[PDB]
Amino acid sequence: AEYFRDEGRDILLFIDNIFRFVQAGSEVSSLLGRMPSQVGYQPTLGTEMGELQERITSTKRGSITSMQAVYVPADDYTDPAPATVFSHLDATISLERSIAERAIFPAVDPLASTSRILDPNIVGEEHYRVAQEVKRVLQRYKDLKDIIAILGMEELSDEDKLTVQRARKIELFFSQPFTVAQQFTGRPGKYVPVKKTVESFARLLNGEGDHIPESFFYMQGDFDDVLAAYEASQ
């Protein structure tokens, strides 16, 4: 890919499971007689990650739009390999086991997922405000998770209650059918433009859609599709 980057061509780079590169390095180091570090990993983990990752850079001659994948052993985000990857990225997306087990196929945790270009000067003031609100909600929800689990929705205040069902609706609404998911799911795929996503979430946060039950936000497109489904079910 560096040949195409060096001559100016825009390159999309998809490296899958950098963690397997780390694991291969670990096995090679174990066979090489190097002293193990942390959980059996190679002592030269950081340097190997630097040597691979620092080559994945958009330079003044060309741009590389990298998109990697990282596999966390078990479900440990404190593992040395993902911990080393985290500091070599611009946009971090965290997939959680619990979200997937809740049938939310994207399974992305908004609280643990950040990005560098989530700045109003780059992505847009409305986009930034919407994202910040969608995180402050679900942050209130993560704070009240234990309260809800042991006592229930009733003990919360009225505004806290409203934020809680808004958070649950948002969590359901982040789910989206994928065109590559037709092989095991019959739901047709949807492509929601970023403008439509921002508008839908702004409308949802305003108060629109409060009357709609949470089950109607599951695996839908923009807010218009949710409203159409609600009208269809009356």
Partner: protein, 48 residues
Amino acid sequence: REVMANLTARVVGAARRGTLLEKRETVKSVALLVVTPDRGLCGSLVAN
């Protein structure tokens, strides 16, 4: 309960059916009474 049944049966005339028992026509103002626990933690009872 039976004293009401025994008494209100005797008093049937609309002219004498005044004061509290008067079934007013063209209702305009309605007052309601709500009783709620003084303390929370009751569950959905207060919300209900």
